[PDB]
Design a protein around this ligand. Structure first.
Ligand SMILES: [Mg+2]
Ligand SMILES: [Mg+2]
Ligand SMILES: [Mg+2]
Ligand SMILES: [Mg+2]
Ligand SMILES: [Mg+2]
Ligand SMILES: [Mg+2]
Ligand SMILES: [Mg+2]
Ligand SMILES: [Mg+2]
Ligand SMILES: [Mg+2]
Ligand SMILES: [Mg+2]
Ligand SMILES: [Mg+2]
Lengths: 185, 52, 159, 235, 52, 130, 15
RNA sequence: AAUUUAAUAUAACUAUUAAUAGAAGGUUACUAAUAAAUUAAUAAUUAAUUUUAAAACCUAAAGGUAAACCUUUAUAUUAAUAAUGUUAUGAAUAAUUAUUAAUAAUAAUAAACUAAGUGAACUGAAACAUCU
RNA sequence: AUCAGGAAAAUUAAUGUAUACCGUAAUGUAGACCGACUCAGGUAUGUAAGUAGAGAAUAUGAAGGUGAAUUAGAUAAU
RNA sequence: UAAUCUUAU
C-alpha cells in the first residue's frame, strides 16, 4: 500500500525562535500541549481526524451497469465506535475505528501497542487523534519508568525569604514570579 | 463649530478697505475666476466676443 | 488677532528672508519648560494664522498663501521640538540601561574617581553635582540613595 | 470660494490622481491651463516638477545678485544683474536690461506713475541661456571646494571657472536683512542653553508628557521574546 | 442639602472667585496639543457676549 | 420659471449638476436612520448609565496643561541672522541616543556645572559637539 | 513669476 | 558655434533571449515629521555599509459594529514609599498627587506557478446511450 | 367573546454628580425621495378654523399655501 | 449478555 493522501500533506514550516529575537504578530494564548504530528491533520475525509481510520480514506469511483452507463459512487470504510482497554492509561478509550484497524489492534495485542509501534507506516496511519493518544501513552510509560528521583520544598523554603529580601529593598514579589525566575536554576 | 458664551463682550475689528489691505480684496481673484470661466466655456464665435 | 488687525497685510507679515524655523540642534539645548512655552507660542501663532487663512480662502478666494506657508513652517518647528523631546527621553533610557549593567557602571565610577576626584592641581561642588546626577540625594530614600551614600562614605575614607 | 476643503484632506485618492497626472498627458493638462491664464500671467517656460528642481546653490549656477550676460535671445549680448529665481520653473528673473515682454495689465496691478494699461515686464530665462561675467564672460563654471560664508550663513561651494580652478568667481554679497518682527526670537535668546544632561536618576521630561511625545500603543514597536514565550510557542 | 444644578452653579462661582478653573479639570494631561481653532466672525443670531 | 434666465428646456436639473453618482462612499453623522450613530472620536470620556444617561469619568478627561511660567521671549521663528546650527557626533555610533555620549555629558556637567556650548555662547558659530 | 515681480516693484516704490 | 542623423531618461506596454531575485491600499485630518555613524577618493560632498526617530483611523480573527465608528480604560492596576487634608484612638482607616518595581496587547498581506480533493456540460462520434 | 392574547433587565444606608457624543436646515400626497424626465404613477405618522350634518360624507373656507420652463390670439373641419 | 445501539440525570 501507499500513504499518498497522508504524506502529500504539507504544513507551514515554523521558524526556530531564539530567546532574543522579536515576537511574531499573533502569538497564541494557551501553549502547545502535544507534539507536532509530522503529517498535519487531514483536509479531505475530516470524519477520520476524530478516529483511528488506519489511513483508509473515502474512495470515489463509478457505479457501472450492464449498459456500462457510468454513475459516480463513493466507497466508505467500515467504521465502528469501539471502547478498547488501555493498560498504560488504566482506562478504556472509545473511538471510531475501521474494522481493519480493530483487527490490527487485536493482532498486535493491545491498543497502546498499536499506538506505540515505531514504524513510519503506523505513524502515517495514526490520525492527529491517534498521534495524541500515542503521546499520552508514551509519556505515561516514561513517567512509570522514571519518577523524578531514582527541590520543590527547597524552593518553598527559600521563597518567603526571597520575598522578604525584595521588600527590604522596596519591591513586592509573588510566587508565580518566583517560580518563573527559578525554573532553570 | 462651537459657540461659546463669555462674561465680557467682544466685537471684531472692522474689515479693511480695498485700497488698504493687499490680501483682503476680492476683486482680483474673482476677476481671474471669471476670465477662466469665459475662456474654458468659450466655444465658437464667442472667442471674438469681447471680454468682461 | 495680531495688533488688533482683521488681517495682516503683506507689510504687516514677517518677511520670508528675515524669518527661519528652529534648527533641531538649537532645540536640543533648551530646557523642557522653555520648549513647552515655545510649543504653545507656536500653537497660538498657528491659531492666529488659521483664523486669517480661513477668512482668505473661504471669503475672498485667494491663492496668496503666505499665511499657509507660515503655518507650515511653524508646524515644522513643532514636530522638530516633538522629535527632540522623544530623543532626549530615549537617550535617558539608554543611559539608565547602561548603568544597570553593573560592570560598566563600576568602570564609569572608577574613571570618575581617577581623574577629577581624589586629585590636586571645587571637589565638594563636584560631589554635590555627582550626587544629584547618579543618586537620589539633593539638599528621598531608596536602594540607589543608600548605594550613593555608601560610595560617598568610601570616597571620604579614601580622602 | 466658500470651500472648507482647506481644513481637511477629503477625497484623498481623487486628489492624488489629479495631482500626479501621467507625464505623457502633461501637454493635455497644461493646454487648458495656458488658455485659462491671461497673457500677463502666463510664462513660456516649462513648469518642472519638484524632483527636478534646483534646491542647492550648486544646482543653480547663479545666485540672485550676480551679474550675467544674456544670449540665445532677442536681448542678446546684454549684461544684467539677476533679481530673483523662480522655483517651480527653474529660471531667473533679470533686471531692466534682460529679456522683457510688453503686455496689457489691469488697474489692480498698476504701478504708481502709469499712463497706459500696457506695461513691459521681465520674462523668465533658464541658466542654460545666460553666461556669467567678471569685462570678461565665463563659458562654464565648476565647483571643487567649499566654505562657510559670513553673509550667506551657509557652507557654500567655490565657483571656479571651468578648466583653470584658481580663477574664483566670487558669490554676490546679499542685502542686509534688517529683522524687526515680533515673531522672530533674537540671536541671544534663540541659542542660550537652558538644558544640560545631568541626571541619570530623574528623567528630564515628565511621565505624563510621554503620550504626546510618542504613541504608547504603537503597532510598529514589536515586543521582544522571552524564554517562557519560546517554550509556549514550541511544541 | 441642596439640588445638583444648584451645587454645580455654586462650584462654578467658587472657581470664578478663585481665579482657578470654573469646572472640574480632568486627569488625562495633554502637554503638547496639536489642535488649532479658527475664531469666526459673529452671525446676526449671536450677541456681542458670544464667540464661535 | 425655476430660474428666469433659463426660459427654455435645457437639460439642466432642478438642483445641482448630476443626479447620479457613486453611492458607495462612507457614511457621515448626518446620514442613516434615527438609530444610526456614527460618532466623531470625541467622547470616550465617561460611562453610559443603565437608564440611558451618562456619567463623566474625570481621570479619563483631556486637560491641556500649559507651563506656569511662560517664556514669551521664545518665538515660533528664529531671526534668520542666526545660522542653522549643526551637531556632530564623531566617535559615537549611537549618535544622540548613544549611552557613552550621555555618560560623557554627565561627567562634563559634574566637573564644570552648566557651562554653555560653542553655539550657545557664540551666535556666529554653526557647528558643535553636543 | 509676474505676481512676485509686481510685489517687488511695489516694495521698491514704497522704499 | 549651430543644425541634422543614430543611441541613451527618473517617463510606455507586448514577444523572445540572457542574467539576477522571490513581491500595501483606502478613510480624513489635532496632516501620519527624522536623526546619526563608519569607510572610500580629493571641510561640504556624492557612493557604499550600518544604526536610529516618528508613523492617526479602516482593511474577519482585544470585544463589538451598518469599513474608516463604538466599547474596553497601560496619562491602568497591585504594591512600596514620600507630601497633602479628614475621621476615630505616638499607631490605625480611606482619598489625591509624584517617583520606584511588577502585569498584557496590535494578522492589510499578494497574484500567477505547484500539490491534493471533488469533478461537469456544451461538444465529437455527421443520431445517441459505451466512448469523447 | 373564543380565535385564549410577547421576551428580557432587588431593596436600604453611606459616599457621590462640574452633567460626554450624534441627530436638529429645507424638502417630505414631492421640482428637493422610488419611477431613465422639474414624470397626472408609487411613498409611513399626527393636527387637520368655524358654519352643516349621523359622519373624517357633501358644500363653503378663517388662517396658511399656491396660481406652475411655455405664451398671445383665433375658436373651420375634426 | 462488559456485542452493539436509544433515552434521561
Ligand atoms: Mg436624513
Ligand atoms: Mg439623549
Ligand atoms: Mg480586528
Ligand atoms: Mg454529435
Ligand atoms: Mg437530436
Ligand atoms: Mg424644521
Ligand atoms: Mg431621484
Ligand atoms: Mg418610466
Ligand atoms: Mg408627480
Ligand atoms: Mg372634503
Ligand atoms: Mg382665505
Amino acid at each position: 500500500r501507499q500513504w499518498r493522501l497522508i504524506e502529500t500533506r504539507k504544513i507551514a514550516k515554523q521558524p526556530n525562535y531564539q530567546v532574543g529575537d522579536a515576537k511574531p504578530l499573533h502569538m497564541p494564548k494557551e501553549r502547545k500541549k502535544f507534539p507536532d504530528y509530522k503529517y498535519g491533520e487531514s483536509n479531505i475525509f475530516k470524519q477520520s481526524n476524530k478516529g483511528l481510520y488506519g489511513g483508509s480514506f473515502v474512495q470515489f469511483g463509478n457505479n457501472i451497469s450492464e449498459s456500462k452507463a457510468k454513475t459516480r459512487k463513493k466507497w466508505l470504510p467500515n467504521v465502528v465506535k469501539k471502547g478498547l482497554w488501555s493498560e498504560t492509561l488504566n482506562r478504556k478509550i472509545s473511538i471510531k475505528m475501521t474494522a481493519k484497524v480493530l483487527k490490527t489492534i487485536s493482532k498486535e495485542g493491545g491498543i497502546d501497542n498499536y499506538l506505540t509501534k515505531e514504524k513510519s507506516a503506523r505513524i502515517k496511519e495514526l490520525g492527529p487523534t491517534g498521534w495524541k493518544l500515542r503521546y499520552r501513552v508514551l509519556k505515561r510509560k516514561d513517567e512509570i519508568e522514571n519518577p523524578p528521583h531514582k527541590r520543590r520544598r527547597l524552593m518553598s523554603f527559600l521563597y518567603p525569604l526571597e520575598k522578604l529580601e525584595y521588600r527590604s529593598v522596596g519591591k513586592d514579589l509573588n510566587y508565580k514570579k518566583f517560580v518563573e525566575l527559578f525554573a532553570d536554576v | 463649530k462651537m459657540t461659546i458664551e463669555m462674561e465680557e463682550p467682544f466685537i471684531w475689528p472692522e474689515e479693511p478697505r480695498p485700497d488698504e489691505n493687499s490680501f483682503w480684496d476680492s476683486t482680483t481673484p474673482d476677476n481671474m475666476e471669471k476670465y477662466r470661466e469665459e475662456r474654458l466655456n468659450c466655444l465658437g464665435s464667442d472667442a471674438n466676443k469681447p471680454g468682461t | 488677532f495680531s495688533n488688533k488687525k482683521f488681517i495682516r497685510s503683506a507689510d504687516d507679515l514677517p518677511p520670508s528672508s528675515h524669518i527661519r524655523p528652529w534648527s533641531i540642534p538649537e532645540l536640543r539645548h533648551k530646557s523642557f519648560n522653555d520648549l513647552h512655552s515655545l510649543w504653545y507660542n507656536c500653537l497660538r501663532e498657528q491659531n492666529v494664522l488659521a483664523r486669517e487663512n480661513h477668512l482668505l480662502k473661504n471669503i475672498v478666494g485667494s491663492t496668496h498663501d503666505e499665511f499657509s506657508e507660515l503655518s507650515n513652517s511653524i508646524r515644522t518647528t513643532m514636530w522638530q521640538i516633538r522629535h527632540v523631546l522623544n530623543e532626549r527621553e530615549l537617550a535617558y533610557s539608554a543611559s539608565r540601561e547602561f548603568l544597570q549593567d553593573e560592570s560598566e557602571r563600576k568602570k564609569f565610577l572608577d574613571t570618575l574617581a581617577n581623574d577629577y576626584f581624589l586629585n590636586k592641581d571645587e571637589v565638594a561642588s563636584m560631589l554635590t553635582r555627582f550626587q544629584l546626577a547618579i543618586f537620589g540625594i539633593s539638599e528621598t530614600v531608596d536602594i540607589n540613595f543608600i548605594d550613593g551614600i555608601k560610595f560617598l562614605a568610601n570616597l571620604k575614607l579614601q580622602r | 470660494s466658500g470651500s472648507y476643503q482647506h481644513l481637511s484632506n477629503v477625497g484623498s485618492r481623487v486628489m492624488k490622481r489629479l495631482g500626479n497626472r501621467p507625464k505623457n498627458f502633461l501637454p493635455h493638462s497644461e493646454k487648458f491651463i495656458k488658455k485659462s491664464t491671461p497673457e500677463f500671467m502666463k510664462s513660456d517656460l516649462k513648469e518642472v516638477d519638484e524632483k527636478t528642481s534646483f534646491k542647492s546653490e550648486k544646482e543653480w549656477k547663479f545666485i540672485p545678485g550676480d551679474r550675467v550676460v544674456v544670449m540665445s535671445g532677442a536681448s542678446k549680448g546684454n549684461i544684467a544683474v539677476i533679481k530673483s529665481f523662480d522655483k517651480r520653473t527653474n529660471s531667473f528673473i533679470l533686471d531692466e536690461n534682460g529679456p522683457t515682454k510688453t503686455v496689457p495689465v489691469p488697474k489692480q496691478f498698476w504701478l504708481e506713475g502709469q499712463t497706459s494699461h500696457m506695461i513691459t515686464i521681465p520674462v523668465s530665462i533658464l541658466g542654460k541661456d545666460l553666461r556669467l561675467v567678471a569685462t570678461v564672460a565665463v563659458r562654464d563654471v565648476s565647483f571643487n571646494g567649499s566654505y562657510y560664508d559670513a553673509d550667506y550663513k551657509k557652507v557654500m561651494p567655490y565657483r571656479c571657472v571651468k578648466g583653470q580652478p584658481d580663477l574664483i568667481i566670487p558669490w554676490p554679497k546679499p542685502d542686509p536683512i534688517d529683522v524687526q518682527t515680533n515673531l522672530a526670537t533674537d540671536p541671544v535668546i534663540a541659542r542660550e542653553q537652558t538644558f544640560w544632561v545631568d541626571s541619570v536618576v530623574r528623567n528630564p521630561i515628565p511621565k505624563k508628557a510621554i503620550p504626546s511625545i510618542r504613541n504608547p500603543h504603537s503597532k510598529y514597536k514589536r515586543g521582544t521574546l522571552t524564554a517562557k514565550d519560546i517554550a509556549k510557542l514550541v511544541a | 442639602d441642596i439640588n445638583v444644578s444648584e451645587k454645580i452653579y455654586k462650584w462654578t462661582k467658587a472657581g470664578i472667585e478663585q481665579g482657578k478653573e470654573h469646572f472640574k479639570v480632568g486627569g488625562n494631561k495633554v502637554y503638547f496639543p496639536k489642535a488649532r481653532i479658527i475664531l469666526l466672525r459673529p452671525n446676526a443670531k449671536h450677541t456681542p457676549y458670544q464667540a464661535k | 420659471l425655476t430660474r428666469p434666465w433659463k426660459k427654455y428646456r435645457d437639460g439642466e436639473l432642478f438642483y445641482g449638476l448630476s443626479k447620479v453618482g457613486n453611492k458607495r462612499v462612507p457614511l457621515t453623522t448626518k446620514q442613516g436612520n434615527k438609530t444610526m450613530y456614527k460618532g466623531t472620536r470625541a467622547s470616550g470620556i465617561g460611562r453610559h448609565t443603565k437608564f440611558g444617561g451618562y456619567v463623566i469619568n474625570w481621570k479619563k478627561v483631556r486637560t491641556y496643561v500649559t507651563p506656569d511660567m511662560v517664556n514669551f521671549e521664545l518665538k515660533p521663528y528664529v531671526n534668520a541672522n542666526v545660522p542653522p546650527l549643526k551637531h556632530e557626533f564623531k566617535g559615537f555610533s549611537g549618535g544622540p541616543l548613544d549611552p557613552r555620549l550621555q555618560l560623557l555629558k554627565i561627567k562634563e556637567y559634574i566637573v564644570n556645572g552648566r557651562v554653555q556650548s560653542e553655539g550657545a555662547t557664540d551666535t556666529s558659530c554653526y557647528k558643535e559637539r553636543g | 513669476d509676474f505676481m512676485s515681480w509686481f510685489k517687488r516693484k511695489k516694495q521698491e516704490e514704497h522704499q
